[PDB]
Amino acid sequence: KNFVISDPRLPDNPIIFASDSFLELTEYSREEILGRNCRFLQGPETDQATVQKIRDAIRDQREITVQLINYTKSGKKFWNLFHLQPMRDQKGELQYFIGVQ
Ligand SMILES: Cc1cc2nc3c(=O)[nH]c(=O)nc-3n(C[C@H](O)[C@H](O)[C@H](O)COP(=O)(O)O)c2cc1C
Hints:
Bound molecules: flavin mononucleotide
CATH superfamily: PAS domain
CATH topology: Beta-Lactamase
Number of helices: 3
Protein name: Phototropin-2
Binding site for FMN 2: 37, 39, 42, 55, 70, 80, 82, 101
CATH class: Alpha Beta
Order of helices and strands: EEHHHEEE
Number of domains: 1
Family: Belongs to the protein kinase superfamily. AGC Ser/Thr protein kinase family.
Radius of gyration: 13 Å
Organism: Arabidopsis thaliana (Mouse-ear cress)
Distance between the termini: 9 Å
Subcellular location: Cell membrane
Number of strands: 5
Largest sheet: 5 strands, antiparallel
Structural class: alpha+beta
Strand content: 25-35%
């Protein structure tokens, strides 16, 4: 129930949907999320080596799980177990990415 959907067919693969659980965890309103790339949750303590693996997984359109530090609106650190998965259409072509926190 804690998930976001991004559209890679739009500039910079922005979040088009976020579940109420995701808004509660990050302390952002729906209006502050829609249209942004998910990277805005990152900050000083975010391991750049883990961010690299996510970039490679998106490029290759492979599913991946990783732990990384993210920041709430009020600058509170929390660990995030992130399960990234591609979503393909009936013609086997990529439409969306789904993330789980
Ligand atoms: C559906 C989806 C959800 C994502 N959720 C997160 C997240 O919760 N935290 C995070 O640090 N990165 C998340 N990312 C990855 C970042 O938005 C971004 O891909 C990452 O920083 C690497 O790309 P960049 O090098 O262009 O920033 C998510 C990506 C997708 C497609």
